[PDB]
Design a protein around this ligand. Structure first.
Ligand SMILES: COc1ccc(C2(C(=O)N3CCC(Nc4nc5ccccc5c(=O)[nH]4)CC3)CC2)cc1
Lengths: 252, 212, 338, 51, 230
């Protein structure tokens, strides 16, 4: 009916944005402290955007057994890369906050490879959690209702109760501290304010709606004519996030 | 590779480890350059090269003075420069302004901040109060200066204004100048350096992220 | 009075200028016009040697063209095996403010100096397996800018006190002191026969000295600003000078003036290092704009660029067999080009 | 103070000088004779290069 | 420079002894240290190697498993813990310092050893076991099973002199280079698998048993020895 028109429109937009973002993220990877985080987020963004675009292109056809299995695997890689990117954005925000609040510690007594250690820990924990949820919840795999619900809510608690508050608070704290400390030096760094608000707004409006959808589907019965729309809009929004991360973080 | 070559490689790895350890140890300290022509009180602010070590709030500081147009290239990586100036003397004040203008506009100190110590303000207070010598005789623009004892304040604010106007003209925001007023019996001269250095390191940190 | 002596000086300076011009008949750019340009040279980073944690300020090749020593502001000398990237020694200095680095021709000693106003000679081939200070040479008033070994007992040092010295390391004394420069002596190049050496100072002039006599044979004056680098032609009858003028100049000793100037309008940065190829046809010059330029010494034409450093090239050496060029920069790395 | 300068200038005024053409030809002849032994000018084969 | 080895004595088979070499006069931590033993009336045999930093330890195939080498850098002591002692371990145990960098002179100091009395591989062959020869020039030959010439241009032959009742002394390293303190009368030459040590103007206090070693690869193998008797 009518809604399939919106489905097709947003699918096409998501595919185009994912192509653009894959190109941009690949360029960011090729051109490469903060550099480790940027490269890791670029790699995770490439994985997420490729998975998303080719999952759409795979969805352009009716379900086939091998095709459906590939669909499932790429869906799981999509969600895994999503979580890794969110954790890495939180890591970048916390790093900026430490460099402002603890400047001499950051310059002098900070371990040289802390970025590598934290990035590896994020990848490992994200793999553990995402793979566990994939094992417990997939249709072509070892699905289990109660335990899948447990693991889904555990990941939801993680994201929307640690990784979102930590980024929002770190960015607001950096904002207020640099505003306090820039009342003497006259350059008055409006670029920093712009970048912080841009990063947080992109996070909260583009990246987080996918977790919001997966919360709403569980706890608020939705009709189908709006569910596909919600998911495809969340698709477009997350694509915009993973495509804007390079220009927001690397180019400036 | 031969056995000799393998053992040479192992020696090289141990040299790398020792190098890295010493480099980290060096990273934990902050390096300052003490400048000031003479009759300024450089030796008495923190009560070929003389090196003075001090720490404030568990942060190590390391200060050098020599005893400049060519060896100043060596100090392009110091945290800050500590330019000490005698604010009591007016015959030598324009010389101090030219010296500061040379330091500020040097092509290697284009990112180095200056902690400016307008030293000997008790002697300035005596000279201004007694009124024997007048700034206007040396700086004509002082008869037409009003502050933004009142007269001693006008004098010291005027001198600091000249230095900060040299700083502001050509800085372009890559480095600033912190002017402090000091005596010869002042003990709060390492906290001043420490606060200025936290601000400097905050700027450098906010500049690694291409933000400021 | 003093006016009479100054007038005699002016007359003699004009007589020098007359004699130099009476010997100028055909420029080197005019005798070299009809020979084949060497074309582009493509040199690539073969070795890049990590390990210094501060700005590299000086390096010297060894005579065997395999070992080299590098000085950095981190206060450590490192002797490298260039064929294998290995580190042979790591010498910790008493003063981290080091500006010069000399490897003795024999290979038994290395020397360094800087703002400490002291040349320290280091014993490499001892028992006990450590490098220990052999001799601390004191007597210069200003910072040491260069030092070059003549043998295992003689070293010539240039200082910022506007003076050079000839030292006997065993006795630790100034055997011959060279005066005549108004400004800080920044560079020093020894002749291939080691009977003469040339000096470059901040007085925008270069002077040719006699080691045995202590006398300034010639003064070469064409630069608009200070001279940072200097080097004999391998023949020993010419030398090149680098300045903050963004220019190199080639001076003859027998004709007794300049021969050729190496400049381009596209480069406006000072020259920090100069070295020659084995035949003298190439003139390697390092620049403040973070890349070295190769010049056809006989045609004043850029034959190539060595762009691999992301800070200014502070030092530059060519091996005695001419195989490799080693460049160090303020980016803590130094590279070997072939 | 200045007697030293005039003495040095006198010692430098009386020096034997060859014409610039002869010096240029000598440098050119040196560069031509050793052009075959200069690796950075004419690159040596990969077997000879130790880097 | 002084390496004083301790331990030593009589042990019944199956016992266990720890030999200690105390280092004085040099930077012990920068040196890799060897244990080289000599049977009562036979040649030199290599036991174990510990590198500077204790990173790399190599043992001989005869003593692998039942021997253990360790160093105590702050106390400047080198240890060899011997277990399961056999009747083929009765020897004088020398301690040898070796430093490895470009241009080094490894195997340059040998300590006076201790006597223990318990009651593939390159084959270095110095066929001439004894040659009579003063004031003249004599030559000693060593042959190797495989070429000692590495592709890095280095050929790894070492010449040692063991005078009567004295620790062996390095004469030549890498078959061309003379050790420090060795008179210029000696020289060495040869190619892979064929070597020679010629001494011109043979003098007294310069006769003993000459050995050749390969340091091309572990295990280090010595030669049988060539004895020069007046
Ligand atoms: C707000 O809570 C959040 C929890 C997790 C996430 C994310 C995630 O990894 N998911 C969500 C998608 C999928 N869940 C899922 N549930 C089912 C339920 C019933 C029947 C089938 C399924 C099924 O096939 N899959 C795997 C886990 C990061 C996206 C986001 C928000």
């Amino acid at each position: 009916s009518t809604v399939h028109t919106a489905y097709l429109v947003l699918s096409s937009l998501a595919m185009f944005t994912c192509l653009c973002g894959m190109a941009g993220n690949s360029m960011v990877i090729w051109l490469l402290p903060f550099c480790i985080y940027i490269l890791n987020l670029a790699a995770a963004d490439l994985l997420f955007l490729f998975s998303m675009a080719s999952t759409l292109s795979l969805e352009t056809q009716p379900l086939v057994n091998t095709t459906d299995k590939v669909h499932e695997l790429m869906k799981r890689l999509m969600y895994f890369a999503y979580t890794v990117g969110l954790s890495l954005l939180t890591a970048i925000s916390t790093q900026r906050c430490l460099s402002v609040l603890f400047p001499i510690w950051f310059k002098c007594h900070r371990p040289r490879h802390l970025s590598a250690w934290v990035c590896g820990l994020l990848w490992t924990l994200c793999l553990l959690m995402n793979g566990l949820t994939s094992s417990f919840c997939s249709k072509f795999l070892k699905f289990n209702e109660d335990r899948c619900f447990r693991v889904d809510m555990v990941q939801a608690a993680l994201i929307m109760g640690v990784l979102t508050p930590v980024m929002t608070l770190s960015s607001l704290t950096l904002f207020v501290w640099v505003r306090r400390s820039s009342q003497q030096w006259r350059r008055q760094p409006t670029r920093l304010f712009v970048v912080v608000l841009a990063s947080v707004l992109v996070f909260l409006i583009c990246s987080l709606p996918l977790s919001i959808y997966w919360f709403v589907l569980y706890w608020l019965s939705l009709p189908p004519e709006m569910q596909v729309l919600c998911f495809s809009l969340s698709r477009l929004s997350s694509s915009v996030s993973s495509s804007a991360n390079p220009v927001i973080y690397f180019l400036v | 590779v031969s056995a000799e070559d393998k053992a040479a490689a192992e020696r090289s790895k141990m040299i790398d480890k020792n190098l890295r350890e010493d480099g980290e140890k060096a990273r934990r300290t902050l390096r300052l350059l003490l400048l000031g022509a003479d009759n300024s009180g450089k030796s008495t602010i923190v009560k070929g090269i003389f090196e003075t070590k001090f720490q404030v709030d568990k942060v190590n500081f390391h200060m050098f003075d020599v005893g400049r147009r060519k060896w100043i290239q060596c100090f392009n990586d110091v945290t800050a420069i500590i330019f000490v100036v005698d604010s009591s003397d007016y015959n030598r004040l324009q010389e101090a302004l030219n010296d500061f203008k040379s330091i500020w506009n040097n092509r290697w100190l284009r990112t180095i901040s200056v902690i400016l110590f307008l030293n000997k303000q008790d002697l300035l207070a005596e000279k201004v109060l007694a009124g024997k010598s007048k700034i206007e005789d040396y700086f004509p623009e002082f008869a037409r200066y009003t502050t933004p004892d009142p007269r001693v304040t006008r004098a010291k604010y005027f001198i600091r204004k000249e230095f900060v106007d040299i700083s502001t003209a050509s800085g372009d925001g890559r480095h600033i100048c912190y002017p402090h007023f000091t005596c010869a019996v002042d003990t709060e001269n390492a906290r001043r350096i420490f606060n200025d250095c936290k601000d400097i390191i905050l700027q450098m940190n906010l500049r690694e992220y291409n933000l400021v | 009075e003093l006016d009479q002596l100054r007038q005699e000086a002016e007359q003699l300076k004009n007589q020098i200028r007359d004699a130099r011009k009476a010997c100028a008949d055909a420029t080197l750019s005019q005798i070299t016009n009809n020979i084949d340009p060497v074309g582009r040279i493509q040199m690539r980073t073969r070795r890049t040697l990590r390990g210094h944690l501060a700005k590299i300020y000086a390096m010297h090749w060894g005579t065997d063209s395999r070992l080299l020593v590098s000085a950095s502001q981190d206060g450590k000398l490192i002797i490298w095996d260039s064929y294998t990237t290995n580190k042979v020694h790591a010498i910790p200095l008493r003063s981290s403010w080091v500006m010069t680095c000399a490897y003795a021709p024999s290979g038994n000693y290395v020397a360094c100096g800087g703002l400490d106003n002291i040349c320290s000679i280091y014993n490499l081939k001892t028992r006990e397996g450590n490098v220990r200070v052999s001799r601390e040479l004191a007597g210069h008033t200003g910072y040491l800018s260069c030092c070059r070994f003549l043998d295992d007992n003689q070293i010539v040092t240039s200082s910022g006190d506007t003076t050079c010295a000839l030292w006997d390391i065993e006795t630790g004394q100034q055997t011959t002191t060279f005066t005549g420069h108004t400004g800080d002596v920044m560079s020093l190049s020894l002749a291939p026969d080691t009977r003469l050496f040339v000096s470059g100072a901040c007085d925008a002039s270069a002077k040719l000295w006699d080691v045995r006599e202590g006398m300034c044979r010639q003064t070469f004056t064409g630069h608009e600003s200070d001279i940072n680098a200097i080097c004999f032609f391998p023949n020993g009858n010419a030398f090149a000078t680098g300045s903050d003028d963004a220019t190199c100049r080639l001076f003859d000793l027998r004709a007794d003036q300049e021969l050729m100037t190496y400049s381009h309008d596209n480069i406006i940065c000072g020259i920090t290092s100069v070295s020659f190829s084995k035949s003298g046809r190439l003139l390697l010059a390092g620049y403040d704009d973070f890349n070295c330029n190769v010049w056809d010494a006989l045609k004043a034409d850029r034959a190539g660029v060595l762009a691999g450093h992301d800070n200014r090239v502070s030092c530059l050496g060519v091996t005695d067999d001419g195989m490799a060029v080693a460049t160090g920069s303020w980016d803590s790395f130094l590279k070997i080009w072939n | 103070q200045a007697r030293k300068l005039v003495e040095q200038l006198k010692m430098e005024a009386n020096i034997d000088r060859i014409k610039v053409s002869k010096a240029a030809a000598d440098l050119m002849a040196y560069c031509e004779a050793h052009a075959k032994e200069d690796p950075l000018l004419t690159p040596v084969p990969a077997s000879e290069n130790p880097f | 420079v002084q390496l004083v080895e301790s331990g030593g004595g009589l042990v019944q088979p199956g016992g266990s002894r720890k030999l200690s070499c105390s280092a004085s006069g040099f930077a012990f931590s920068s040196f890799g240290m060897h244990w080289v033993r000599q049977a009562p009336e036979k040649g030199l045999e290599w036991v174990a190697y510990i590198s500077s930093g204790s990173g790399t330890i190599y043992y001989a195939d005869t003593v692998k498993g039942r021997f253990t080498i360790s160093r105590d850098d702050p106390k400047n002591t080198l240890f060899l813990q011997m277990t399961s002692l056999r009747s083929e371990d009765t020897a004088m145990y020398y301690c040898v310092r070796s430093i490895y960098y470009y241009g080094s002179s490894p195997f340059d100091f040998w300590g006076q050893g201790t006597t223990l009395t318990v009651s593939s591989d390159i084959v270095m062959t110095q066929a001439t076991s004894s040659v009579p020869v003063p004031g003249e020039s004599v030559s000693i030959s060593c042959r190797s099973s495989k070429s000692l010439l590495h592709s890095n241009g280095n050929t790894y032959l070492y010449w040692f002199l063991q005078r009567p009742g004295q620790s062996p002394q390095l004469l030549i390293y890498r078959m061309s280079n003379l050790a420090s303190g060795v008179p210029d009368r000696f020289s060495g030459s040869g190619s892979g698998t064929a070597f020679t040590l010629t001494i011109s103007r043979l003098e007294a206090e310069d006769v003993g048993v000459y050995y050749c070693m390969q340091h091309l690869e572990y295990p280090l193998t010595f030669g049988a020895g060539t004895k020069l008797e007046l």
